[PDB]
């Protein structure tokens, strides 16, 4: 299954931020609230906002931060890239142990979809190689965050900003830097051509081997360079050393070398599946990470 | 449009670990009662329970131990009365869901929540979940205006890999029983009303390739549906699909003709919302709640 992390530690951090008639979601950690900076924007200055100039015309008392219907008094404000940081006079007592991290394409995370500071649902997302996610977001969702949880430490990696004309979604890390070549303005922007997440397909093949489905295992190997050149001819991502390293645990568990599995996938790309299934599916799955695979058997 | 689970925080605060002897599983702590699968007492259930004392039960809520001051059994569920009320108890109800309805599962191990995902109660009263050793006592639920409706407590994995469990009154969904015994489910069928709901979701999200100019009657559609092991579509289902048909301007029986064509022709390697298979685990409410 696509399995999200339990969302409770994040739910306790969700607030709403209103500037004018514009309300979006914010993230309340200790005595700072993080939210998309375009909350300060007006309907007439959003085609290309001068955020620096627009923020100079703003004061602490222009910002309405609410935990539910309880107002949190704002005592400071600053901008860091595309996020606004509102210092408030109350430390959130539900603040979990947390980190801010920037994830890489192929990595998965849970999204807590929120409207008016109230969580509405949770689901797993994979960052595509073109730095979009296939999410489920409506108006009012901006400021919803994505996260992973490791040993009760919440690593926030995504804050929601945009829906591209193709219906996929784009956002920033929690330091306000967009994933991919996008901008927080009211314009139609296009992602790069997407590719298949090779390291995740490999993890999926390891998962099939773990469960006894191993017809696709062959008697060949490859170099990583040779595989990377063939992979790109099939719209598959090239592998990095970090991808090879994160496949280590599954490689050891099955006893199938990473480069051996690469040679197995290489056959699958050049010969097709031939009406055979892998884990009961005609299509190769590329949104399970190596960690997701080990977790679903741990 | 994605499979979306309810936020799990209100349930996480209720999960505890229940231990009897060498057996441990998860329990649900609401006010001053912990609910868990009764086979936690096993190494004839009424005979085995009468032989247990309160002190045979260890209940851990995080790192604090709750003292069991009483115990009873309601069908396949054990009810352990504890000396502490759970301050995190949400407003809650116990409900028995209908086949074809969906819920969120909070998979837990050793009293610690691990993952959350959406399941449907299959027509054969199994669920297609993701549960491992130690997942017993994990619960399924829906949330409506901060009220948690608990509908499922997890008990077993069938040889086929699907899952079986009880409502919170301890009564199994399906013809299953809580013994260490291989059990087969009845023949499963596809939840027709949900497939139609999902095709409507695809149209609301700008996918229209499966639509056709044809229409069908309700009975003619049901003849083909039954031939393909789909559940019958009732007029109540047609009524429930009203909002989605109103939103999209596609009559329910028009969408039925689309589904009939899909069933007789196949998808021909094309895709709907990324799936090569017809999806039947979104209810009409699930589609409305998410698309709007
Ligand atoms: C002509 O221009 C366009 C053309 C074609 C495609 C386009 N797409 C966007 C866009 O995405 N614009 C951002 C705002 C900018 C400043 C980043 C936005 O609309 N974000 C939503 C979430 C979105 C809304 C629906 N589904 C989501 O994911 C917020 O949540 C904040 O807006 P709200 O105040 O809540 O309505 C503009 C645009
Ligand atoms: C001959 O026997 C069999 C043959 C063929 C298939 C079979 N299937 C089962 C079964 O499922 N048996 C229940 C216990 C009975 C008494 C209800 C069980 O094992 N439930 C798990 C969750 C399970 C564990 C793996 N995935 C899950 O969903 C608990 O959580 C409690 O067990 P644990 O103490 O946690 O290990 C027995 C059996």
Numbering used by the authors:
A (entry chain A): 4 to 301
B (entry chain B): 3 to 45, 53 to 301
Copy text from the publication.
The main protease (Mpro) of SARS-CoV-2 is a salient enzyme that plays a vital role in viral replication and serves as a fascinating therapeutic target. Mpro is able to cleave the bio-synthesized viral polyprotein 1ab (pp1ab) at 11 specific sites to produce a variety of mature non-structural proteins necessary for viral replication and transcription. Among these, PF-07304814, also named lufotrelvir, is a highly soluble phosphate prodrug of PF-00835231 and a first in class 3CL inhibitor to treat SARS-CoV-2 infection. In the current study, we expressed six Mpro mutants (G15S, K90R, M49I, S46F, V186F, and Y54C) that have been identified in Omicron variants including the recently emerged XBB.1.16 subvariant and solved the crystal structures of PF-07304814 bound to Mpro mutants.
The prepared samples were successfully crystallized and the crystal structures of PF-07304814 in complex with these Mpro mutants were solved to 2.29-Å (G15S), 1.95-Å (S46F), 2.05-Å (M49I), 1.75-Å (Y54C), 1.97-Å (K90R), and 1.70-Å (V186F) resolution, respectively. All these complex structures are in space group P1211, which is different with that (P212121) of wild-type Mpro-PF07304814 complex. Two of these mutations (G15S and K90R) are distal to the substrate binding site of SARS-CoV-2 Mpro, while the other four mutations (M49I, S46F, V186F, and Y54C) are located in or nearby the substrate binding site. Though four other substitutions, namely S46F, M49I, Y54C, and V186F, situated nearby the binding site of PF-07304814, no significant changes were found in the orientation of PF-07304814. Similar with that in wild-type Mpro-PF-07304814 interface, a C-S covalent bond is formed between the HMK warhead of PF-07304814 and the active-site cysteine (Cys145) in Mpro mutants and a tetrahedral carbinol complex is generated. One obvious difference is that a water-mediated hydrogen bond with Thr26 can not be found in the interfaces of mutant Mpro-PF-07304814 complexes. The binding energy between wild-type Mpro and PF-07304814 is -9.2 kcal/mol. Among these, PF-07304814 shows the least binding energy with V186F Mpro, but shows the highest binding energy with M49I Mpro. The binding energy values between PF-07304814 and these Mpro mutants are − 8.9 (V186F), -7.4 (G15S), -7.4 (K90R), -6.8 (S46F), -6.6 (Y54C), and − 6.3 (M49I) kcal/mol.
